[PDB]
Coordinates of C-alpha atoms in Angstrom, one line a residue:
Chain R
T1 CA 65.4 -162.9 122.5
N2 CA 64.9 -166.5 124.2
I3 CA 68.7 -166.6 124.7
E4 CA 68.7 -165.7 128.5
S5 CA 71.2 -167.5 130.8
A6 CA 74.8 -168.6 131.1
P7 CA 76.8 -171.1 133.4
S8 CA 78.0 -170.1 136.9
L9 CA 81.8 -169.4 137.3
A10 CA 81.7 -170.7 140.9
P11 CA 83.0 -174.0 141.9
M12 CA 80.2 -176.3 142.6
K13 CA 79.8 -178.4 145.7
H14 CA 80.1 -182.2 145.6
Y15 CA 77.1 -184.5 146.6
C16 CA 76.8 -188.2 146.9
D17 CA 75.1 -189.6 143.6
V18 CA 73.5 -192.3 145.7
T19 CA 72.3 -190.8 149.0
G20 CA 72.5 -187.0 148.1
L21 CA 74.7 -186.4 151.2
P22 CA 77.9 -184.5 150.7
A23 CA 80.6 -186.5 148.8
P24 CA 84.5 -186.1 149.8
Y25 CA 85.2 -188.9 147.2
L26 CA 85.0 -189.5 143.5
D27 CA 85.2 -193.2 142.5
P28 CA 87.9 -193.5 139.6
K29 CA 86.2 -196.6 138.2
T30 CA 82.5 -195.7 137.8
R31 CA 82.9 -191.9 138.5
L32 CA 80.1 -191.8 140.9
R33 CA 80.5 -189.5 143.9
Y34 CA 79.9 -191.1 147.2
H35 CA 79.6 -190.3 151.0
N36 CA 81.4 -193.1 152.6
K37 CA 82.7 -196.8 152.5
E38 CA 79.2 -198.2 153.0
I39 CA 78.0 -196.5 149.9
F40 CA 81.3 -197.4 147.9
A41 CA 80.5 -201.1 148.8
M42 CA 77.1 -200.9 147.0
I43 CA 78.5 -198.8 144.2
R44 CA 81.1 -201.3 143.2
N45 CA 78.6 -204.2 143.3
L46 CA 75.7 -202.5 141.5
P47 CA 73.8 -204.3 138.8
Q48 CA 75.7 -203.7 135.7
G49 CA 73.4 -201.0 134.1
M50 CA 72.6 -199.1 137.3
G51 CA 75.8 -196.9 137.3
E52 CA 74.7 -195.0 134.3
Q53 CA 71.3 -194.1 135.9
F54 CA 73.0 -192.6 139.0
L55 CA 75.0 -190.5 136.6
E56 CA 72.0 -189.7 134.5
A57 CA 70.0 -188.3 137.5
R58 CA 72.6 -185.4 137.2
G59 CA 72.6 -185.5 133.5
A60 CA 76.1 -187.1 133.3
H61 CA 76.6 -190.1 131.1
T62 CA 79.6 -192.2 130.0
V63 CA 78.6 -191.1 126.5
Chain Y
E1 CA 154.1 -202.2 155.0
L2 CA 150.3 -201.8 154.7
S3 CA 148.9 -198.3 154.6
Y4 CA 146.9 -197.3 157.7
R5 CA 143.6 -197.5 155.8
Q6 CA 144.7 -201.2 154.7
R7 CA 146.0 -202.0 158.2
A8 CA 142.8 -200.9 159.9
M9 CA 140.4 -202.8 157.7
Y10 CA 142.8 -205.9 157.4
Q11 CA 143.1 -206.1 161.2
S12 CA 139.4 -205.8 161.7
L13 CA 138.6 -208.7 159.2
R14 CA 141.7 -210.8 160.2
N15 CA 140.3 -210.6 163.9
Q16 CA 137.5 -212.8 162.6
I17 CA 140.2 -215.7 162.6
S18 CA 139.5 -215.6 166.3
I19 CA 135.8 -215.7 165.9
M20 CA 135.2 -218.2 163.1
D21 CA 137.0 -221.3 161.4
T22 CA 135.7 -219.6 156.0
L23 CA 139.4 -219.5 156.2
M24 CA 139.6 -219.4 152.4
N25 CA 136.9 -216.7 152.2
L26 CA 139.0 -214.6 154.8
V27 CA 142.4 -215.1 153.2
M28 CA 140.9 -214.2 149.8
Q29 CA 139.9 -210.8 151.2
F30 CA 143.3 -210.6 153.0
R31 CA 144.7 -210.7 149.4
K32 CA 142.1 -208.2 148.2
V33 CA 143.1 -205.4 150.9
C34 CA 146.7 -206.3 150.6
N35 CA 146.4 -205.3 147.0
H36 CA 144.4 -202.1 147.3
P37 CA 141.7 -201.3 149.6
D38 CA 139.6 -199.7 146.9
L39 CA 139.1 -203.1 145.7
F40 CA 137.3 -204.0 149.0
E41 CA 135.8 -200.6 149.7
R42 CA 135.9 -197.7 147.2
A43 CA 136.8 -194.3 148.6
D44 CA 134.0 -192.0 147.3
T45 CA 132.9 -188.4 147.9
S46 CA 131.4 -188.2 151.4
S47 CA 129.9 -185.8 154.0
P48 CA 128.8 -185.8 157.7
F49 CA 126.0 -187.8 159.0
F50 CA 122.7 -186.1 158.4
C51 CA 120.4 -186.0 161.3
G52 CA 117.3 -185.2 159.3
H53 CA 114.5 -186.3 157.1
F54 CA 114.5 -186.2 153.4
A55 CA 112.3 -187.7 150.5
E56 CA 113.9 -190.9 149.0
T57 CA 113.8 -191.7 145.4
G58 CA 111.9 -195.1 145.3
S59 CA 112.8 -196.0 141.7
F60 CA 115.3 -194.8 139.1
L61 CA 113.6 -196.7 136.2
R62 CA 110.2 -194.9 136.8
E63 CA 111.9 -191.3 137.4
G64 CA 112.5 -190.4 133.8
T65 CA 114.8 -187.7 132.3
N66 CA 113.0 -184.6 133.8
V67 CA 112.7 -184.4 137.5
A68 CA 111.8 -181.7 140.0
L69 CA 114.2 -181.4 142.8
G70 CA 112.2 -180.0 145.9
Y71 CA 114.0 -178.9 149.0
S72 CA 112.8 -181.8 151.1
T73 CA 115.2 -181.5 154.1
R74 CA 113.4 -181.3 157.3
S75 CA 114.3 -181.8 161.1
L76 CA 113.5 -185.3 162.6
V77 CA 113.2 -183.2 165.8
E78 CA 109.7 -181.8 165.6
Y79 CA 107.8 -179.4 167.8
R80 CA 104.1 -179.9 167.6
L81 CA 102.3 -176.8 168.6
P82 CA 98.4 -176.0 168.4
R83 CA 97.3 -173.3 166.3
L84 CA 95.6 -171.6 169.2
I85 CA 99.2 -170.9 170.4
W86 CA 101.2 -170.7 167.2
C87 CA 98.4 -168.8 165.0
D88 CA 95.3 -167.8 167.0
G89 CA 96.9 -165.3 169.4
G90 CA 99.2 -167.1 171.7
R91 CA 102.0 -165.1 169.9
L92 CA 101.6 -161.7 171.7
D93 CA 103.0 -159.7 168.7
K94 CA 100.7 -161.1 166.2
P95 CA 97.5 -159.1 165.7
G96 CA 94.2 -160.7 164.8
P97 CA 90.9 -161.5 166.5
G98 CA 91.7 -162.5 170.1
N99 CA 95.1 -160.8 170.1
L100 CA 93.3 -157.3 170.4
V101 CA 96.5 -155.9 172.2
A102 CA 99.1 -156.4 169.4
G103 CA 97.4 -154.1 166.8
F104 CA 97.2 -151.1 169.2
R105 CA 100.5 -151.8 170.8
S106 CA 102.4 -151.9 167.5
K107 CA 101.1 -148.4 166.3
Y108 CA 101.6 -146.6 169.6
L109 CA 104.9 -148.0 170.8
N110 CA 106.6 -148.1 167.4
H111 CA 105.1 -144.9 165.9
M112 CA 102.9 -142.4 167.9
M113 CA 104.7 -142.5 171.4
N114 CA 108.1 -143.5 169.5
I115 CA 110.8 -140.9 170.0
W116 CA 112.6 -141.6 166.8
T117 CA 109.5 -140.7 164.5
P118 CA 110.4 -137.5 162.6
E119 CA 107.7 -135.4 164.2
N120 CA 108.9 -136.4 167.8
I121 CA 112.6 -135.8 166.7
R122 CA 111.7 -132.5 165.1
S123 CA 110.3 -131.2 168.5
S124 CA 113.7 -132.1 170.3
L125 CA 116.3 -130.7 167.7
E126 CA 117.7 -127.5 169.5
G127 CA 119.6 -126.4 172.5
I128 CA 119.9 -128.9 175.2
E129 CA 117.2 -131.3 173.8
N130 CA 118.1 -134.9 173.2
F131 CA 118.5 -134.9 169.6
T132 CA 120.5 -131.5 169.4
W133 CA 123.4 -133.5 167.9
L134 CA 121.5 -134.8 164.9
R135 CA 122.4 -131.8 163.0
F136 CA 126.1 -132.7 163.2
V137 CA 125.7 -136.5 162.7
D138 CA 125.3 -137.1 159.0
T139 CA 122.0 -138.8 159.4
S140 CA 118.7 -137.2 158.4
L141 CA 115.6 -137.4 160.7
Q142 CA 114.6 -140.1 158.1
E143 CA 117.8 -142.1 158.3
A144 CA 117.7 -141.9 162.1
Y145 CA 114.2 -143.2 162.0
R146 CA 115.1 -146.0 159.7
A147 CA 118.2 -147.0 161.6
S148 CA 116.2 -147.1 164.8
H149 CA 113.4 -149.5 163.3
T150 CA 115.2 -151.8 161.0
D151 CA 117.3 -154.5 162.3
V152 CA 121.1 -155.0 162.1
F153 CA 120.9 -157.1 158.9
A154 CA 118.6 -154.6 157.0
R155 CA 121.0 -151.7 158.3
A156 CA 124.1 -153.5 157.0
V157 CA 122.4 -153.9 153.6
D158 CA 121.9 -150.2 153.6
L159 CA 125.4 -149.6 154.3
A160 CA 126.4 -151.5 151.3
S161 CA 124.9 -148.6 149.0
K162 CA 127.0 -145.8 150.8
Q163 CA 130.1 -143.9 149.7
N164 CA 132.9 -143.2 152.2
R165 CA 133.1 -139.6 150.8
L166 CA 134.6 -138.3 154.2
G167 CA 137.5 -140.5 153.5
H168 CA 138.0 -139.0 150.0
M169 CA 137.8 -135.6 151.5
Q170 CA 140.8 -136.4 153.7
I171 CA 142.8 -137.0 150.3
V172 CA 141.6 -133.7 148.7
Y173 CA 141.1 -131.1 151.5
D174 CA 144.7 -131.4 152.8
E175 CA 146.3 -127.9 152.9
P176 CA 146.1 -124.9 155.1
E177 CA 144.0 -123.2 152.5
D178 CA 141.5 -126.2 152.7
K179 CA 141.4 -125.7 156.5
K180 CA 140.8 -129.5 156.7
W181 CA 137.3 -128.7 155.3
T182 CA 134.4 -130.9 156.4
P183 CA 130.6 -130.3 155.7
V184 CA 129.2 -129.0 158.8
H185 CA 126.4 -131.5 158.9
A186 CA 129.3 -134.1 159.3
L187 CA 131.2 -132.2 161.9
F188 CA 130.9 -134.9 164.6
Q189 CA 132.3 -137.6 162.2
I190 CA 135.8 -136.8 163.3
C191 CA 137.2 -140.2 163.1
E192 CA 135.9 -140.7 159.6
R193 CA 137.3 -137.4 158.5
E194 CA 140.6 -137.9 160.1
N195 CA 141.9 -141.7 159.6
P196 CA 145.1 -143.2 158.3
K197 CA 143.3 -146.0 156.6
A198 CA 142.3 -143.5 153.7
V199 CA 145.8 -142.2 153.2
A200 CA 147.6 -145.4 153.4
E201 CA 145.7 -146.6 150.4
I202 CA 146.7 -143.6 148.1
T203 CA 150.4 -143.5 148.9
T204 CA 152.4 -145.3 146.2
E205 CA 155.0 -146.7 148.7
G206 CA 152.4 -149.3 150.3
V207 CA 154.5 -149.3 153.5
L208 CA 151.6 -148.6 156.0
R209 CA 149.2 -150.4 153.5
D210 CA 151.0 -153.5 154.1
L211 CA 151.6 -153.2 157.8
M212 CA 147.7 -153.1 157.9
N213 CA 147.3 -156.3 156.0
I214 CA 150.0 -158.5 157.7
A215 CA 147.6 -160.8 159.3
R216 CA 145.4 -161.5 156.1
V217 CA 148.6 -161.9 154.0
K218 CA 150.5 -164.3 156.3
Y219 CA 147.1 -166.5 156.8
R220 CA 147.1 -166.9 153.1
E221 CA 151.1 -167.3 152.8
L222 CA 150.9 -170.1 155.2
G223 CA 148.6 -172.1 152.8
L224 CA 145.9 -172.5 155.6
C225 CA 143.5 -171.4 152.9
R226 CA 144.3 -174.4 150.7
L227 CA 145.5 -177.2 153.1
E228 CA 142.9 -179.9 153.5
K229 CA 140.4 -179.8 156.3
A230 CA 141.7 -181.9 159.3
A231 CA 138.2 -181.9 160.8
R232 CA 134.5 -181.5 160.2
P233 CA 131.4 -182.1 162.4
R234 CA 130.5 -185.8 162.6
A235 CA 126.8 -185.0 162.3
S236 CA 124.8 -182.2 160.6
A237 CA 121.2 -181.3 160.9
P238 CA 118.8 -178.7 159.4
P239 CA 117.0 -176.4 162.0
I240 CA 114.2 -177.6 164.2
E241 CA 110.7 -176.6 163.0
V242 CA 107.4 -175.9 164.5
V243 CA 104.7 -178.3 163.1
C244 CA 101.4 -176.8 163.1
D245 CA 98.3 -178.1 161.2
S246 CA 97.6 -174.6 159.5
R247 CA 98.3 -172.7 156.4
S248 CA 99.5 -169.7 158.2
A249 CA 102.3 -171.6 159.7
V250 CA 103.4 -172.8 156.4
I251 CA 103.4 -169.3 155.1
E252 CA 105.1 -167.7 158.1
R253 CA 107.8 -170.7 157.9
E254 CA 108.6 -169.7 154.3
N255 CA 108.7 -165.9 155.2
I256 CA 111.2 -166.4 158.1
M257 CA 113.2 -169.6 157.5
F258 CA 113.6 -168.9 153.7
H259 CA 113.4 -165.1 154.1
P260 CA 113.5 -163.6 150.6
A261 CA 115.0 -160.2 151.4
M262 CA 117.8 -161.6 153.4
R263 CA 118.4 -164.3 150.7
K264 CA 118.2 -161.6 147.9
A265 CA 120.7 -159.5 149.8
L266 CA 123.3 -162.3 150.4
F267 CA 122.9 -163.5 146.7
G268 CA 122.7 -160.3 144.9
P269 CA 120.8 -159.0 141.8
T270 CA 118.7 -161.3 139.7
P271 CA 119.9 -162.0 136.1
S272 CA 117.1 -160.1 134.4
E273 CA 117.6 -157.1 136.8
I274 CA 121.1 -157.0 135.5
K275 CA 120.0 -157.0 132.0
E276 CA 117.5 -154.3 132.7
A277 CA 120.1 -152.1 134.5
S278 CA 122.7 -152.6 131.8
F279 CA 120.4 -151.8 128.8
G280 CA 118.3 -149.1 130.4
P281 CA 118.4 -145.7 129.0
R282 CA 119.4 -144.0 132.3
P283 CA 121.4 -145.6 135.2
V284 CA 119.4 -147.4 138.0
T285 CA 120.7 -148.4 141.5
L286 CA 120.1 -152.2 141.8
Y287 CA 119.4 -153.9 145.0
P288 CA 121.4 -154.9 146.9
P289 CA 123.5 -153.8 144.6
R290 CA 125.8 -156.6 145.0
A291 CA 126.0 -160.2 146.5
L292 CA 126.8 -159.5 150.2
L293 CA 127.7 -163.1 151.0
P294 CA 131.2 -163.0 152.1
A295 CA 134.1 -164.8 150.3
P296 CA 134.6 -168.3 152.0
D297 CA 137.7 -168.3 154.2
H298 CA 138.6 -171.9 153.1
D299 CA 139.3 -171.2 149.2
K300 CA 138.5 -175.0 148.4
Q301 CA 136.1 -176.2 150.9
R302 CA 133.9 -173.3 150.9
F303 CA 130.7 -173.5 152.5
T304 CA 129.9 -177.3 152.6
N305 CA 131.4 -180.2 154.6
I306 CA 131.7 -182.5 151.6
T307 CA 135.0 -184.1 150.9
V308 CA 136.0 -185.5 147.5
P309 CA 138.6 -188.3 147.5
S310 CA 142.2 -187.1 146.3
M311 CA 144.1 -189.2 143.8
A312 CA 147.1 -188.6 146.0
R313 CA 145.1 -190.2 148.8
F314 CA 144.2 -193.1 146.5
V315 CA 148.0 -193.6 145.8
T316 CA 149.1 -193.6 149.4
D317 CA 146.1 -195.8 150.5
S318 CA 147.9 -199.0 149.1
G319 CA 151.3 -199.6 150.4
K320 CA 152.0 -201.7 147.4
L321 CA 150.9 -198.8 145.1
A322 CA 152.8 -196.1 147.2
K323 CA 156.1 -198.4 146.9
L324 CA 155.1 -199.1 143.2
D325 CA 154.8 -195.4 142.3
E326 CA 158.6 -194.9 143.1
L327 CA 159.5 -198.1 141.3
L328 CA 157.4 -197.1 138.2
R329 CA 159.0 -193.7 138.2
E330 CA 162.4 -195.3 138.3
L331 CA 161.3 -197.8 135.6
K332 CA 159.9 -194.8 133.5
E333 CA 163.5 -193.3 133.9
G334 CA 164.8 -196.7 133.1
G335 CA 162.9 -196.6 129.7
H336 CA 160.1 -198.9 130.4
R337 CA 156.4 -198.3 129.9
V338 CA 154.0 -199.8 132.5
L339 CA 153.7 -203.5 132.2
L340 CA 152.1 -205.5 134.9
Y341 CA 150.1 -208.6 135.9
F342 CA 147.6 -209.1 138.4
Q343 CA 145.8 -211.8 140.2
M344 CA 142.6 -209.8 140.6
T345 CA 141.0 -208.4 137.4
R346 CA 139.3 -205.5 139.1
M347 CA 142.7 -204.2 140.2
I348 CA 143.4 -203.5 136.4
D349 CA 140.5 -201.1 136.5
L350 CA 142.2 -199.2 139.5
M351 CA 145.5 -199.2 137.6
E352 CA 143.9 -197.7 134.6
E353 CA 142.3 -195.1 136.8
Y354 CA 145.7 -194.5 138.3
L355 CA 147.6 -194.3 135.0
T356 CA 144.9 -192.0 133.6
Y357 CA 145.5 -189.9 136.7
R358 CA 149.3 -190.1 136.2
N359 CA 149.1 -190.0 132.4
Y360 CA 151.8 -192.6 132.0
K361 CA 151.2 -195.2 129.4
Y362 CA 150.7 -198.9 129.2
Chain I
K1 CA 131.5 -164.4 116.1
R2 CA 129.6 -161.3 116.9
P3 CA 130.6 -159.8 120.4
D4 CA 128.7 -160.1 123.6
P5 CA 125.8 -157.6 124.0
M6 CA 127.1 -156.4 127.4
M7 CA 130.8 -157.3 127.9
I8 CA 132.8 -154.1 127.3
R9 CA 136.3 -155.0 126.3
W10 CA 139.6 -153.5 127.2
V11 CA 142.9 -154.5 125.6
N12 CA 146.3 -153.2 126.1
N13 CA 149.6 -154.0 124.2
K14 CA 152.6 -152.2 122.8
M15 CA 150.3 -149.7 121.1
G16 CA 148.8 -148.7 124.3
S17 CA 145.2 -149.7 125.0
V18 CA 141.6 -149.2 123.7
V19 CA 138.1 -149.8 125.0
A20 CA 135.6 -151.3 122.5
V21 CA 131.8 -151.1 123.3
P22 CA 129.1 -153.5 122.0
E23 CA 126.7 -152.0 119.5
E24 CA 123.9 -153.0 121.9
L25 CA 125.3 -150.6 124.5
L26 CA 125.4 -147.6 122.3
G27 CA 122.1 -145.7 122.9
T28 CA 122.2 -147.1 126.6
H29 CA 123.4 -145.1 129.6
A30 CA 126.6 -147.0 129.4
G31 CA 127.3 -145.3 125.9
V32 CA 127.1 -141.9 127.5
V33 CA 130.7 -142.1 128.7
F34 CA 131.7 -142.9 125.0
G35 CA 129.8 -140.1 123.4
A36 CA 127.0 -142.6 122.4
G37 CA 124.2 -142.3 124.9
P38 CA 120.4 -142.4 124.2
Chain S
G1 CA 96.8 -150.9 160.3
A2 CA 96.9 -154.4 161.6
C3 CA 95.6 -157.1 159.2
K4 CA 95.4 -160.9 159.1
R5 CA 94.5 -163.6 156.5
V6 CA 91.9 -165.6 158.4
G7 CA 91.8 -168.3 155.8
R8 CA 90.2 -169.1 152.4
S9 CA 86.4 -168.9 152.3
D10 CA 84.9 -172.4 152.0
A11 CA 82.7 -171.3 149.2
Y12 CA 85.9 -172.2 147.3
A13 CA 86.4 -175.5 149.1
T14 CA 85.9 -177.2 145.9
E15 CA 88.1 -175.2 143.7
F16 CA 90.2 -178.3 143.7
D17 CA 89.7 -181.8 145.3
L18 CA 93.0 -181.5 147.2
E19 CA 94.9 -178.2 147.9
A20 CA 97.2 -177.3 150.6
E21 CA 94.8 -174.7 151.8
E22 CA 92.8 -174.0 155.0
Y23 CA 89.1 -173.3 154.2
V24 CA 86.9 -171.2 156.7
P25 CA 83.3 -170.4 156.8
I26 CA 82.3 -166.7 155.7
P27 CA 82.0 -164.3 158.6
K28 CA 78.2 -164.4 159.8
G29 CA 78.1 -161.2 161.7
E30 CA 78.5 -157.6 160.4
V31 CA 81.5 -157.0 158.2
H32 CA 82.2 -153.9 160.2
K33 CA 82.5 -153.8 164.1
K34 CA 83.3 -150.8 166.3
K35 CA 84.4 -151.6 169.9
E36 CA 86.2 -149.6 172.4
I37 CA 89.3 -151.1 174.2
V38 CA 90.9 -149.3 177.2
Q39 CA 94.6 -150.1 176.4
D40 CA 97.1 -150.1 179.3
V41 CA 101.1 -149.8 178.8
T42 CA 103.7 -148.8 181.1
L43 CA 106.7 -146.5 180.9
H44 CA 109.0 -149.7 180.8
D45 CA 107.2 -150.9 177.7
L46 CA 107.9 -147.5 176.1
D47 CA 111.6 -147.8 177.0
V48 CA 111.7 -151.4 175.5
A49 CA 110.1 -150.3 172.2
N50 CA 112.3 -147.3 172.0
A51 CA 115.6 -148.9 173.0
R52 CA 115.6 -151.5 170.2
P53 CA 113.5 -152.8 167.2
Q54 CA 111.1 -155.2 168.7
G55 CA 109.4 -158.3 167.4
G56 CA 109.0 -158.5 163.6
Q57 CA 111.1 -155.5 163.3
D58 CA 114.2 -157.8 164.1
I59 CA 114.0 -161.1 162.4
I60 CA 117.8 -161.6 162.7
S61 CA 117.2 -162.2 166.4
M62 CA 116.4 -165.7 165.4
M63 CA 120.2 -166.3 165.3
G64 CA 120.6 -165.9 169.1
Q65 CA 124.0 -165.2 170.5
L66 CA 125.0 -161.6 169.8

């Protein structure tokens, strides 16, 4: 039939977009998920285009 | 002279003449309090000191027109307990892992080896056995069992449903032919079947009815139900609470300290329940079925310590106003409407409030 | 103004008294006393 | 007939980012356990349990006094 799966209804776990470690925090500015203040420090001073790449690694985008 | 309210504040602020100089600033507020103390500090609705925490509103402008008022009131005295004690089995009656005793002990001491369970009672119901009397007390084995397991509050709620039918029998089964009839399963309720209280309520000359209400009548006739309160507690607080960093504690706080069944019993049936019961095809007995909260003994102060300032208090709080009140009534009977001149403009506002109380006209 | 659905009204005067029953209570159990149950 | 809510399973720990809830791991042993406990009581314990409602049967005891 070639139509053959559906999304899960379970809530997904949250991982840091940078280091992949678990992420308690979601940055409201760039919407990257991050592990700790050390990674937040690099996120907020990323080269301007890089934020969309960390999203795109999980298929997320601003648009 | 000055009213005691004026006299107290005036004396406390004129005492500053001994401390400083500012004399003009002081004598200005002499003239203020000597006109009316509500110019200096307005009398306004007030209550005891609250020895507790609450959430303050931080802004009015940001608040908006629709706001949720949570019950924020908590104690500042604050009993920190570990969950090992308060949740994980340091409470001996709370069953769970760790507290392996409580689950067994609850079943066996309250049911299996409990003498009030119907199977145990039924084995003891004849002859010289300890429940022999239960045939002649009007309770069933089920009601006896209930009354032995429910607390005094729950039992009192159950009493609210019942009819004093043995008192009605005293009105009807009077005569020698009636043999003072009593249902044999109520034989031992002698003092319910024979009691002047029932008869005194049915006789048309209410003589013994009034003799039994003397205390409640004269209490009310003395006006003690309406006289102002002469005292109240100077501080007030909410209950002390356990603080435990667990969700079970928060649930159990709500279950006990805000107990739904007790509150529902006190405050009565919910409005939809009243609608359902009144529109139903067949009658239904509500719970509880009425509000079991008593009437407050003070018919005006009710259940709170909040005072509202009286206009009579406002009138007598200024000696000038108290003296002027007689003069204005004399001047009214002398045919003059109110016409007065004031050195302080805010005193005109108090006089407008005074006149809108009195309903005399400028 | 149409009367309240659930306030039964008693009125007494020189002519004696009457009870009037809302049309919403006829066909309820509260109508049974008046000859107007379910 | 005793039962206790141990918590919320941490498989739901991200059902929200903040909730007033306590999240616990799933139990990792058997769902069923059978164990035999030799319980001891005393005749006085039976007196007390039968003399008056005890524990959660009597909540109004929180008032003290009478």
